[PDB]
Amino acid sequence: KVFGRCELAAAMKRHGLDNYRGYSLGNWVCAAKFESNFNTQATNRNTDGSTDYGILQINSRWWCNDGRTPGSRNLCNIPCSALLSSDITASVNCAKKIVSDGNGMNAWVAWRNRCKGTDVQAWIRGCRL
Ligand SMILES: [Cl-]
Ligand code: NA
Known part of the structure; x- marks a missing residue:
């Protein structure tokens, strides 16, 4: 599923x-825009051979199991395919663990490089929330 911004x-x-x-x-919406273009089915391979999955491009090196990322972990206890669902509950729940792991949203390098310190409130401007 490709979400709209609001x-x-x-x-x-x-x-x-x-x-x-x-x-x-x-901040969350800006991170989602640059990680996945708001597309839950986004996947991208990393240079180390891990893969990033879903709307917030959660990496199989630490957070989900994809069966093909050697020496990796599964700290969210989910198959990475769960993170591609039209239902974003699993990505959100795993994101809450990631952003609690000590570096806040710097865990998302796209957030640090494109969202951090910007007028992130523009990403929800006008949204009936
Ligand atoms: Cl923080
Ligand atoms: Na993994």
Whole structure:
């Protein structure tokens, strides 16, 4: 599923990301735009052979099992395919663990390089929330 910008902001709010660990909703939406273009089926291979999955491009090196990432972990206890669902509950729940792991949203290099310190509230401007 390819979400619209306000559609995604609403589903993230419902599943509790708004101000989770202090990150306003526009931070989450900006991260989703640059990680996946709001597409839940996005996948991208990393140079180390891990893969990133779904709307927030969660990596199989640490967070989900894809069966083909040697020496990796599964800290969210899910198959990475779960992270491609039109239902974003699994990605959100796993994201809450990631952003609690100590580096906040810097875990998302696209967030650090394209969202951090910008006017992220523009990403939810006008959204009936
Ligand atoms: Cl933080
Ligand atoms: Na893994």
